[PDB]
Symmetry: D2
Subunit: 235 residues, 4 copies
């Protein structure tokens, strides 16, 4: 009871980090829309989880890369739970490999799911955010999006591009009191620690904590920021 | 009741931002030690405030620049409320002017109150933090410490130096599960908005929110970070 | 006579910044390949310029977005002038507008010309660079790619993504002594200054200077960096 | 013959990195003033070196920490070689140790030699720079000043503070066409490589290259920047 029945849309909330985010957001009192590729099993399992502990949630199988199968999905969300106050872009495909083994298949998959998706969902929710004078957009940006990483040029470019998006949107909506920030997780279980000063993996609910903080009113004057959750990895 | 009766030490908690921090930390259920230069009136007024709404607090007039009048103050705190889990370095003097009008008086005042103080308090609390395997150190770093500012070379250098301290400590204590992070407030009332995208000043309790988040268990995997609260100013 | 007859490939060297880069690189004694969309007039005018003052140069009309019409172009370059030592990615389309007026046409044009192109050219030159133990890749990254910009979410995302690419490649090739860096120009004539501390536009040959430095042996231990040429704009 | 007989002042140019800088600056055709603690032997050896290969140079034993024994030194320089166009702050003491073993002796030595010195020399040269409408100030900022380092909290704070100084001065002098930038060297021989992607130490003349570039007219639109020379270490 800290989100006050607001509506959160978590793309790629199917599983893992997104699942922790959806669970957390719901437990703070927000109706969560779970958008996914996706296996429907994990998604309705996530919703069943949110409901089991008394939270409001819905699921939406959507292609985040389609220019607006997204819009269909978004005003479906708006119809079902109401206008979006919180948008979490977590949809993303990983396809590693040296920049010379990288392929258009890999490249465009990664780029469309990790970067384009955010563009299209932000496009969909943009006039609502503005007409409301409130809003918190949270993009998932990888620590490899902050300082790069070998053999992940395609994923890392997508995540860095996501950070650029975050900044530009934040500047774009700042005067209409709509915030946009980025989250840069490091090494996270679940499914090496040398450059990680804390010498341990992170848990998803630790990332979920940061998403929840960025989504609430405690971060009302924070916008355009890139916050790592990496155990100090990319400090 | 979210700090669980832990102990927070807020240097420069006399007034303004520090006061909002002390108030906030206390309201989340932490015994707060208010360390100040300082006018005692505002400090015991802050404590009287914390107490009035049922919080635990003490005041300590200390010179943050003395090499260890600080230590006296710190184990006074430890004697009175207990070992420190949360350390907030907010002590700081501002003395503006073009780098050629800057004076040793100004320079050393700013540098000792804004930078040295943090060094000495971190020195004091350092073995406690380590022996406990827990800890959250929050340094106040100005947005002018992030991208500089004209006519504030002396203050800005102090704040940037504070960010360097933050990083080095975070690396230094990471394996013993002690976090260290920096907060970079922008334009904050109370006592021009063109480079501020949100086109408004910030309120102190908005900065206090970020300090509280960085102090709790929601930021347990965050360390070595520099988070602005500037309305997007230094994004 | 400071490039020693090495071979530089400048995509988008048709005109403007790219033209200044090609001219400069040539004047330091490098055979320059001018790759462009492009109007052929400006390109062969650029080559005619390089030749007029005694430099070696060739032109290549290529689609930087085609997955490898690029490769055809690149081993054309290799056939004509020799293996590439210096790669400058300057190809880029600008299509501004609020993130809700942004269109797939705009979006994919910007993203493919500004980001994908770099991927494909780096792909093409990658084994040459490695087999040689030398190499300097210079990506053009905008200052709007560093801190974002309103109404340029699509361009800014592309440029930030370019910075992520730069980092990942630098890490990827570092051990084989191949450098990769990014250049972030600010406001540049030729064809407002408030956030620009120097209170003036930049000239293209000033950016060209930085490209030339990053291309030579004076920057042999510099890699993975993002250097602004913005009059302090994004400091 | 690329500095055109301008005057460069290199504090801590006694030895090592500073020596490479003084040598390099001189070879590009600049009269170099070698300011040092210092052993006079190495300094006049450096000058003897510059002279041996036909360069103009002078030496000045000065306490960079004295508030203005510095000024005496600076208008000595001005008397001997002429007004300063280039200022390189390289004076610095290193005294490592965990933040709890750090001592006022250590702390103030490091802070005064690494940070205060820059303040005082910039103070001395500031009206000359302004009256001339030209100028390049180069501060040496360590890579540990960029992302911190364990057991070097005191040195790292000094170097980060140096970066803050750089920014503030750059903003402060930008309109009078005086540039200020920072150099962040990584692991440099002469007198472990895991976080260094290039898997090798750097040579001093590689850092000297960057200083020379930042000192000339090739970087005329670059100001307020922090450029690493670390083999990608702090990318």
């Amino acid at each position: 009871g800290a989100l006050s029945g607001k509506v959160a849309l978590v793309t790629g909330g199917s599983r893992g980090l997104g699942r922790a985010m959806a669970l957390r957001l719901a437990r703070d009192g927000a109706a969560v829309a779970i958008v996914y590729v996706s296996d429907d099993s994990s998604a309705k399992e996530t919703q069943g989880e949110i409901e089991r502990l008394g939270g409001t949630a819905r699921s939406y199988r959507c292609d985040v890369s389609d220019a607006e199968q997204v819009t269909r999905c978004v005003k479906a969300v708006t119809a079902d739970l109401g206008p979006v106050d919180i948008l979490v872009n977590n949809a993303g495909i990983i396809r590693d490999g040296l920049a010379a083994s990288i392929k258009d298949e890999d490249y465009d998959a990664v780029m469309n799911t990790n970067l384009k998706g955010a563009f299209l969902f932000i496009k969909a929710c943009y006039f609502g955010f503005i007409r409301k004078r409130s809003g918190s957009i949270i993009n998932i940006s990888s620590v490899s999006g902050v300082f790069g990483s070998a053999g992940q040029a395609n994923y890392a470019s997508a995540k860095a591009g996501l950070i650029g998006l975050t900044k530009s949107i934040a500047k774009e909506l700042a005067e209409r009191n709509v915030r946009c920030n980025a989250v840069a997780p490091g090494l996270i279980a679940t499914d090496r620690l040398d450059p990680v000063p804390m010498r341990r993996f992170g848990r998803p609910d630790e990332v979920a904590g940061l998403v929840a903080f960025l989504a609430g009113d405690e971060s009302s004057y924070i916008t355009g920021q890139v916050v790592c959750v990496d155990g100090g990895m990319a400090m």
